């Protein structure tokens, strides 16, 4: 099986191609953050919208969200979302999904196929929102480090986030809890 | 709240201090791998030992397993497990846990306290096993890159893993599925 190799190979898939970064980010670092953000968003949404989400399925979907990038590499969203490329790349992503875990024990292979092909629209939406939050957070950290090339990126992502918070109360709450002062300049909790 | 800052600050906590690495590893990369390994181990154990584990609680425990290292830094196990330091460092880790999420909404703060203070012995044990698997995997990748300084590390971790597989059938199955050929020299799944 290639499953464990793929989990570690995600460290070789860089994000933010075409942008200068003070800290290079790989898909594994990004995915760790997205799992944590997805969890927090889920807890806020459950309390706000009076429900219980299947957190096992959500966390697993966040965990493997970007696993197909071990084949596709990470195509930055200004490229991937071009009208010329949007639908072709989604078709490519589907071809990758269908071939990835080709050599597993069937109880395990079905569980992985279940995650990658999850048709739960709400779980898909939470992780998409988490992905946007994480990209915004990275842009905040780069600007904090002094990276002026990320100012316009932070502005674009922050504008979209602001528009999202008008339609999704759990995102507005997340923004109020964590994104108005991010990153923390003084790491008081270390001491 | 410091929660989101801490999630990203884990990228500044290096592992393997005192060892030459071809690839520097941080706690966020390691934690991503441990979440995935914990999931796989859980699925194997459920099928082998005829049970169902609360995977939400397991995945959350793996996700925040090392969060106190944002305060303690990552103390390598040959140091942390010295008889002089073993119990003091565990007491330190407990003091950190008690102070970490000091400024959260109570529904969220209780959920985080619930994770960090989880007294589920089986979940604790799965993640401890996942931690050992991940450390072994890292040592395999370093040796694969040509890092002779990791040969003795790989030998030590592999010896302990082998002894563990004699007592835990789900670990023996994991080893048979993934660890006999790791990492993959030819990344066929990319093509
Ligand atoms: N304004 C921007 N300029 C350049 N790259 C950007 C960007 N906004 C996002 N990215 C990159 O696209 C990735 C996000 O895509 P996903 O949500 O699919 O992970 C980001 C990191 O490469
Ligand atoms: N033989 C060895 N020589 C040096 N560092 C080692 C080691 N074995 C493990 N480490 C490091 O200790 C960490 C593992 O500890 P945890 O399980 O608590 O994460 C490893 C990476 O720093
Ligand atoms: Mg993502
Ligand atoms: Mg760990």
Curated annotation (Swiss-Prot), chains A, B:
- Keywords assigned by UniProt? Cobalt, Hydrolase, Magnesium, Manganese, Metal-binding, Plasmid
Which positions bind Mg(2+)?
Answer: 30, 65-66, 131
The record's annotation in InterPro entries points to: HD/PDEase_dom (IPR003607)
The GO terms describing molecular function are:
hydrolase activity; metal ion binding
Where is 4'-phosphooxetanocin A bound in this sequence? 15-16, 74, 77, 80
The Swiss-Prot or TrEMBL record lists the needed cofactor(s) as: Mg(2+); Co(2+); Mn(2+)
At which positions is oxetanocin A bound?
16, 74, 77
Q: Does the keyword DNA-binding apply?
A: no
Co-factor note (free text): Is most active with Co(2+). Shows lower level of activity with Mn(2+), and weaker activity with Mg(2+) or Zn(2+). However, Mg(2+) and not Co(2+) is probably the relevant metal in vivo. The metal content of the active site is modulated through substrate binding. A dinuclear metal center is observed in OxsA-OXT-A-PPP and OxsA-OXT-A-PP complexes, while a mononuclear metal center is observed in OxsA-OXT-A-P and OxsA-OXT-A structures.
EC number(s) on file: 3.1.3.112
Listed under catalytic activity are:
4'-phosphooxetanocin A + H2O = oxetanocin A + phosphate
The record's top EC class is hydrolase
Q: Which Pfam families match?
A: YfbR-like (PF12917)
Q: What does this protein do?
A: Phosphohydrolase involved in the biosynthesis of oxetanocin A (OXT-A), a nucleoside analog with antitumor, antiviral and antibacterial properties. Catalyzes the hydrolysis of phosphooxetanocin A (OXT-A-P) to generate oxetanocin A (OXT-A) and a molecule of inorganic phosphate. Can also bind and hydrolyze OXT triphosphate (OXT-A-PPP) and OXT diphosphate (OXT-A-PP), and thus catalyze the sequential hydrolysis of tri-, di- and mono-phosphorylated oxetanocin A compounds, releasing one molecule of inorganic phosphate at a time. In vitro can also use dATP, dAMP and dADP.
Q: Which family does it belong to?
A: Belongs to the 5DNU family.
Subunit and interaction comment: Homodimer.
Entry domain remark? Has a mononuclear HD domain phosphohydrolase fold.
Quote the protein name from its UniProt record. 4'-phosphooxetanocin A phosphatase
What is the native source organism of this protein? Priestia megaterium (Bacillus megaterium)
Q: Which gene encodes it?
A: oxsA
